[PDB]
Amino acid sequence: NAMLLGVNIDHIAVLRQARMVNDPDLLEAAFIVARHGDQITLHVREDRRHAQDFDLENIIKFCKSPVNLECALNDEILNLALKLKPHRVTLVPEKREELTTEGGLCLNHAKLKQSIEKLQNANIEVSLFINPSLEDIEKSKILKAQFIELHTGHYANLHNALFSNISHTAFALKELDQDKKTLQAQFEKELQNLELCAKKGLELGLKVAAGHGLNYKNVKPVVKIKEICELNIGQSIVARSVFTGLQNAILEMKELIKR
Amino acid sequence: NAMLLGVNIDHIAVLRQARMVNDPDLLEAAFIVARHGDQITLHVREDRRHAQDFDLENIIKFCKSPVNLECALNDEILNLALKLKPHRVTLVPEKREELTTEGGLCLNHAKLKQSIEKLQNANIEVSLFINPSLEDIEKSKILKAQFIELHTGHYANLHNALFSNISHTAFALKELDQDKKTLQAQFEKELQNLELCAKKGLELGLKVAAGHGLNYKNVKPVVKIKEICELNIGQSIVARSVFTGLQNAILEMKELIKR
Known about the structure:
The structure is a homodimer.
Chain A: E1 4-8, H1 10-19, H2 26-36, E2 39-43, H3 53-62, E3 67-71, H4 75-84, E4 88-91, H5 112-121, E5 125-130, H6 134-142, E6 147-150, H7 153-163, H8 180-203, E7 207-210, H9 219-223, E8 230-233, H10 235-244, H11 246-256
Parallel strand pairs in A: 1-2, 1-8, 2-3, 3-4, 4-5, 5-6, 6-7, 7-8
């Protein structure tokens, strides 16, 4: 039935950290997400590139919304999650040791199982951010994750390449400078694979989310995958907000994911 | 009479460069500034942190608006200005050799005079971004600048410290952790000095602009300085746009600078 929208506010913090004058104010933005979205997502990186520990504290203390903290396996941020107790933690990679070549979390990491254990023991829901592969979905089930989040980045880039002007710009991805026929086949395959992976997740009793790189154009085929129950989207919504304001950017996305 | 508003779009490019997917699209934003603002400002840094050479090219070729390029004294960007011919160039410092301790351009720089010469010879209007000091205003007149832009940053920080919550946040400036009485006196002095400097500029036949750090609160005392004819504002407008959209953020600022 109805898809849930988590709004990742990281790129609002990107703007804020750029000038260091507390503007835009992330707690202000969070209040808007709280009202118009279904969950507030933020990634508190070890390197503190954007969202900060005080943002997580303030949002948990002040906002009427589930909170989805994205974080890696470092003790500092896991300890903070254990102390502050967001509703959900989505484990994402930061360090080489946590990363796979495609960007999903390495499910063989020596600390992953105990990390999941500690969070679940604290009654925090755990999602694993994973490459869309059937093998990783099975591994996630074995690790006792409730939730998985499929990495839509490669799908998103392929969609951008095929259906937008990006290849004509300075932002073109050299990897995707290929004939269109090949790209079309890769896109179809990647989209088919997303659907198969969502089906597998649901078959194993996992809840399936998606959302990295999703924008107001490439989201549409993803909405048609019935087995994905949630999307976490940030950068494209922040990018739209510059034109329409954050409330309207969220509401526009909500309208697209109706089904 | 009527204050002109230049909108600096650099922080829209900050968002764009953060994810490298051409979103937000700077040319889209420029069209909005073209319509609702009085000039489009952008700073093409040698290090290409945000606004890029292609942005300057595209805006000059596609937008119905005066363009104010901010740039430093490096040959690469000066040559680009000479080739593309924005309406105005505002010379700002980037390198240690160009910088003063307060952030204004060093008016003793060995290449400044010839740089001004080349630009004016190409029929490009030249503004110098300067600390608000009477000595620098006189030096700017001697250098044959048409325009000066007073560095309002220190004024802005003092206003933020006195009239907002910034001192209670992670963004508090350690330099301004001082008793309020001292800060109030510094603020009054800095504002008085801005007015005196604008008066001097006008007395010498210069056109006087201002605008760094200006926001929807600290702008108000600056509007009361009759001798400032133009404000160039970026970061606060981009920060407001996340909430209201860029058109509305510009129009709100235009309403504040009515007098």
